[PDB]
């Protein structure tokens, strides 16, 4: 690629700390590139905010951009903005995803959720636990949210200090060999007690084994999304690490406030910037107007218990291949593929001219300036209309390049769509109908194993349905509606690729999904091979 | 905030700086100068990592002064030091050429020294086997020499030989403790033979109330940091013979000889002889400088030698150490010698003055060379000229200050080297005729050394110090080799400075106004640093 180059300057030996750190690379030289370490813009985005702890600002564009630590070392400022480090309390209007959700009006909005279960070979101590908690929760304000109404109107309230942060469970499987369904069940339960009114957001149970023990975590997705997991990940490592040492828990300076977030995020969908997408939206809303997904079974408002889960896995050497050295032949990024491989997918399965995906992006756009949410936790997740096109799908060369060309045209990562459909004054939305209602959802979470496997702790074995997926079948009620008819939702964990199609029995066969996910896995691989051969 | 450790590397060098500075709980992000380390922290950190055999150059960790920046310069250990034992001719270095040099009257008699302390007594047995691995271990212990043909000759002894003498004292049954361990230590200090002996005396005072570890060497196999080796190998030593284990320390780093050896080369190479227009210019500059003397006395010995002291409290102490540097991005030394400008700016009419600097000598010089744990007489001397006459302001000094020790080409290891060691017809005109009347030797830091779990610095070190102050370490018809002697070290958390002078040269009062102005100048130095 470039051969090792070491750092010569302060800045740059900070970048290649940092940069070692959020990529699972042991030795970074300054020629090495972003990309090729398996860097995508959600480690752009932690590089960012382990920067803004050392008083150095950066912009995600400036990574990706100039990929190089030599390169970027020149973009480096000092931060001159210092960010609201007190208590956050009071009201913070919906952002578009919560408008989305709450206009959903789900059965059992409370078992909305997402969730993770981390392993420590040595035991975790509950009084360690329940001193980070504390401290996790007083800052990071956003997880003291509670959802309350005035007529009929959802007013989400940030809390302050002195209530009830999260609770706390602990239970003693020591003495028995059923922990896996144990942890299932006990898992379950907790999933079922989120109190939106009151009650904290955030479940914390400790299951003590004869061989280690396990740390549940469930969080409504109202008040966190996955950039914010690797957060709370992160700040629960350093501060077991901190009370182990003896030391003070201290976690990182806040970044802005999900509240302050959410106020400029108001205004912005009635600026120029967001109005001048409008001809764009509208051109995608004309194309897809028609377009509709078929089924095997024609019927009406599913839920959530008549879903079922098929997984693919990418074996660890064709996802190192993916994430590292497949971007270099077109210079795509890895959404351009994973889309090109969706794309030959429902070109092969179905008989359409052109299949509309709910895309998900992090969304954590440098939309505002002066904005800088790199390190806060809360749901930024954005969610957009993508038209793939599926007559053209050869020579392979062709649709990739059409496939990026696709991605590259789309404002600002799409996440303007949804500040137009649920923000922005009626009037200020030119003629959008908002009427394009994907059935396809398709989802990649991004890269966990640098957040999860730490010295102190690692992902479970028994993680089971909690998961940061949507996948996970505790995070939701079993009574709750199906919003898409084909949930596609992936994430690297443990080295792989796993990538699972959910859908609703009552609306598709079996066989139709096995036909759907073999066709993905062998054009994803075909794919990888013809980028990296 | 704390920030732990993350990867193995990160957590050796953790653990390093701890016992290295003596700090409990050290973060990945905490400033090496901040927590009060300076070179010789830094050659400890070295050595120590040494013995994990993983490789770190001193000006890493200088330059990228925390452990999660260090840690990216820290390599696998590729070259392995001679662990047998060595043996043979060990060509003289350069402060051994100058001693031999001064022909000092009994020569034999001029020794570092220290006392430890251990509440709980010191096993005999124990101590015995310890130093037996120490002087095993540590070859240039065993040195010794002769004259062949009118030329001193220093020879590398093998093992098999008399390592050390070994003294015991029961005064378990008599109050006079202190007047007992001070005479009888003066009394071993007068008994070493270059020709054959040890050079190391090791003398147990058992008391009432604890035991007492007298240790002297000869200066000519021993230093500084090589005193800091030793009480860290004791310690290992006798915690491994408490938990009943074998006594082993860590790897050897390169031999005297083989250090001595490529000295020899390094000191007609061009690297060396390209500093010879600076030193040519600094003797230049000071033929002009003559010290003041209350009176003017020829040959003065020891016996005539007087010390006066002045300690700085703990908390300027520390503040000196840890808080002062970050004003000026200073190094100690900037600091210690813009007092000394100072201190003769008040004390004396002079425009400049010209002071023997020391230092610890174990500078990068020599590509292959690792001395980071060897023990030997290391330490440099070089002539440093203080501008007397732009002392103010103070901010202006202290910059002036560090500008004139930057361009000292690597920190004066090579005037000494171009003196004694460097070929006659490669040495330029240069005249050494740049005589010491005024030295400056800050030896450094001690507590994390000599304070162990397992003993600690005795409170009757007495005339036993590791400075020239120590009235024991030199014979009182030892010739003073400078008119005024200023000796500093940290101990008891405290800067402690000694004032040595011969009381036929100088009145008390005329010291006591240059030590007191001392005093007064470091800590206007300090309040400044620190008040801004």
């Not at 509709?292 to 008549?306: F, G, I, R």
């Not at 997984?311 to 971007?327: S, W």
């Not at 954590?364 to 749901?379: F, K, L, Y």
Request: proline fraction near 4%.
């Amino acid at each position: 690629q470039a051969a090792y180059h070491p750092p010569r300057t302060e800045t740059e030996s900070i970048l290649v700390s940092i940069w070692q750190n959020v990529l699972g690379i042991e030795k970074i030289g300054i020629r090495d590139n972003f990309y090729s370490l398996g860097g995508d813009s959600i480690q752009a985005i932690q590089v960012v905010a382990r920067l803004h702890s050392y008083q150095l600002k950066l912009e995600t564009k400036d990574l990706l951009n100039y990929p190089t630590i030599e390169q970027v070392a020149l973009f480096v400022k000092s931060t001159t903005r210092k960010s609201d480090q007190g208590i956050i309390a009071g009201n913070v209007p919906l952002t578009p995803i919560q408008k989305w959700f709450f206009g959903k009006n789900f059965t059992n909005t409370g078992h909305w959720n997402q969730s993770s279960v981390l392993y420590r070979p040595e035991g975790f101590d509950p009084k360690v636990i329940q001193s980070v908690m504390d401290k996790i929760i007083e800052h990071h304000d956003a997880l003291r949210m509670v959802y309350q109404h005035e007529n009929g109107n959802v007013v989400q309230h940030n809390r302050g200090l002195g209530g009830q942060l999260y609770d706390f469970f602990s239970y003693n499987l020591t003495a028995q060999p059923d922990v896996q369904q144990a942890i299932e069940a006990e898992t379950q339960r907790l999933h079922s007690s989120m109190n939106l009114q009151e009650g904290p957001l955030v479940k914390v149970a400790l299951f003590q084994t004869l061989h280690g023990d396990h740390l549940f975590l469930a969080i409504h997705h109202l008040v966190v999304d996955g950039i914010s997991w690797r957060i709370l990940f992160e700040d629960l490592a350093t501060g077991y690490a901190q009370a182990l040492a003896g030391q003070a828990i201290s976690l990182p300076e806040k970044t802005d406030s999900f509240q302050s977030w959410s106020q400029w995020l108001q205004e912005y969908a009635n600026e120029a910037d967001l109005l001048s997408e409008i001809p764009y939206w509208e051109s995608l809303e004309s194309q897809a107007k028609n377009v509709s997904l078929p089924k095997d079974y024609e019927v009406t408002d599913c839920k959530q218990k008549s879903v079922r889960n098929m997984r693919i896995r990418l074996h660890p050497e064709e996802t190192e291949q993916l994430l590292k050295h497949a971007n270099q032949a077109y210079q795509t990024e890895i959404n351009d593929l994973l889309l090109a491989a969706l794309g030959l997918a429902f070109a092969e399965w179905s008989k359409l001219a052109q299949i509309v995906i709910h895309l998900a992006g992090h969304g954590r756009e440098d939309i505002i300036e002066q904005a800088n949410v790199a390190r806060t936790v809360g749901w930024f997740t954005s969610q957009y209309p993508v038209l793939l096109d599926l007559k053209q799908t050869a020579p392979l060369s062709d649709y990739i390049k059409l496939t990026k060309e696709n991605m590259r045209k789309i404002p600002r990562k799409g996440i303007g769509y949804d500040i137009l459909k649920h923000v922005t004054l009626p009037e200020n939305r030119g003629s959008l109908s908002f009427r394009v209602q994907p059935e396809v959802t398709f989802n990649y979470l991004g890269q966990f194993d640098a957040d999860m496997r730490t010295e102190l702790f690692t992902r479970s074995p028994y993680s089971g349905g909690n998961t940061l997926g949507a996948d996970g079948k505790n995070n939701l009620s079993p009574e709750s509606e199906v919003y898409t008819a084909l949930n596609i939702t992936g994430l690297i964990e443990g080295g792989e690729l796993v990538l699972t199609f959910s859908y609703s029995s009552e609306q598709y066969r079996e066989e139709s999904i096995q036909q759907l996910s073999q066709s993905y896995q062998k054009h994803l691989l075909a794919i990888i091979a013809h980028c990296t051969e």
